[PDB]
Amino acid sequence: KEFTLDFSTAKTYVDSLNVIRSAIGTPLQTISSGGTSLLMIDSGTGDNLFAVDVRGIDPEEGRFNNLRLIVERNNLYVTGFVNRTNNVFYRFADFSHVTFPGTTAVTLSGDSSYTTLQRVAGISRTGMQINRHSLTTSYLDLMSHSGTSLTQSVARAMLRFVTVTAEALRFRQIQRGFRTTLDDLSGRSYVMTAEDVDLTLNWGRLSSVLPDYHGQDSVRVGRISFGSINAILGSVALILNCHFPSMCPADGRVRGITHNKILWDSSTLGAILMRR
Amino acid sequence: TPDCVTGKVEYTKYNDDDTFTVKVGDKELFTNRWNLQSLLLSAQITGMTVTIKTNACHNGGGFSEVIFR
Amino acid sequence: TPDCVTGKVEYTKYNDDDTFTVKVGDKELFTNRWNLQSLLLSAQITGMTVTIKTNACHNGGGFSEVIFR
Amino acid sequence: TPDCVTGKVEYTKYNDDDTFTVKVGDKELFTNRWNLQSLLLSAQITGMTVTIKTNACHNGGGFSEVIFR
Amino acid sequence: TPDCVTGKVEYTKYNDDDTFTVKVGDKELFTNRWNLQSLLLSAQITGMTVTIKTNACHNGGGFSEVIFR
Amino acid sequence: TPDCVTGKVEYTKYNDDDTFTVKVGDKELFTNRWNLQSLLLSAQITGMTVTIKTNACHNGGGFSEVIFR
């Protein structure tokens, strides 16, 4: 129930994410190649919350160690942050009844969805930039926060940490892309591409279709398209168990359909087959 | 118009007289609105829940109002 | 025209007078442009976020401009 | 009109005289009904089981009734 | 006609006069061809890459030639 | 007619000179039959494999027989 996310080097960062994925998910031997397996969130034994401690923003001296993110497990909802200084856990409005041991709790005015974080934040995820500088900044903003309101500064700080923790946790594609600005000395910066966003909007539908996988040439869901098993594992690292609102589509409306060696999610197939 | 039956589309039939038929629940209802044929088959494929509205609520009754959910 | 509602399509209804109703956000609006029919069902099926643009921004209002994001 | 063949659609074929042929089961039938074409290709791509009803239940024979399940 | 822009469709918009708008690249362009509306919408639902050809290669410009890739 | 080319649709050109041209295999063939064009677009968009049969089997040649697998 306590994990660490070391932002010290691209190696400590990636090694951190891997520890948490092995801890909450089990390999689907069905989708595997190169000693990398697609993992599925082990949702069989109840839902719980866990803390993720942010460490390593300032690798030099290590001051910025008072940020802690509370994460739900079966859907990896980031329910909010905890300022380890006064131990107040600020949770999003859509989790008004969530509590974490050892903390007092303050409810924020806005909810967790991206629609809200993007309004308040004043920016969009597509084109959003991230590097150690913006992360150092985003830490101070949350730390110097007190109060009820979801301020532009908090929304921007959360868009960023939600991307490098939960989104990265789910997609090797987002970790691969971000990873490198941690070792880059010149302070480049990772830019969240539209393809990266398209991925995040299709987690539920993918999680639903992927276990139906049995060697088709390709898998198509929405705007996301995979050419082979390797294109998949290079992109998705963790899926939901669709055998706290569940992120899985509403039972029996998203089934994978296979035609001519290509695996489709049925909502996508259905929507494009209507010729007028 | 009142609600007749609600559910998933059990199956669709293309008729000899160019009218389209659906089975939602205990009823078998048909429609002769051409542009409804694409919509219903997609509802069918994607497992949507439809609500057929008609006063002719009985096997063989016609319809022209549906709610896709 | 100004932005009326933005959100996923909650449900669609094929009306008897051959218009098409849609429920986004809290407003229930309709269109009479035959073309928008399959386009909106596709939208509803895939979970696309849509912006409906209209002056008649009240339950029962009509529209014809939709942005498909 | 009697059942004739039932199964998934093996392949479809657009012919020179603009009719559409369907290969289901062992029989390979066809139809002059323009609207069944779109509907049948979707059935073929989604793997629905279909049932063709016709008197001409012999390879090369025409049909016009179809059940989509 | 000359190549004007190439990429995925970011969004589409059904306009008031039944002309459909696509945003591909850094340009919004529109077409008056009806038959193209659902095809571009589908190109958007599936992330397909398209090239739009036209002499009016500036925002708001019109087009009727497309290549689906 | 002899099979001319077999494979996925590499790309379709929806023209102004109103001719629809598809690239299948190594040739670029065109067809003027109105319904055959929506069908080939669905085949392209969903990944179907087609076989175009024709005697005019050369770049620029026309056709009207297609098999959908």
Automatic annotation (TrEMBL), chain A:
The keyword Signal applies. It comes from the Bacteria. It catalyses: Endohydrolysis of the N-glycosidic bond at one specific adenosine on the 28S rRNA. Disulfide bonds join 242-248. Its EC number is 3.2.2.22. It is an enzyme of class 3 (hydrolase). One of its GO terms (molecular function) is rRNA N-glycosylase activity. Keywords: Disulfide bond, Glycosidase, Hydrolase, Protein synthesis inhibitor, Signal, Toxin. GO terms for biological process: negative regulation of translation. This is rRNA N-glycosylase.
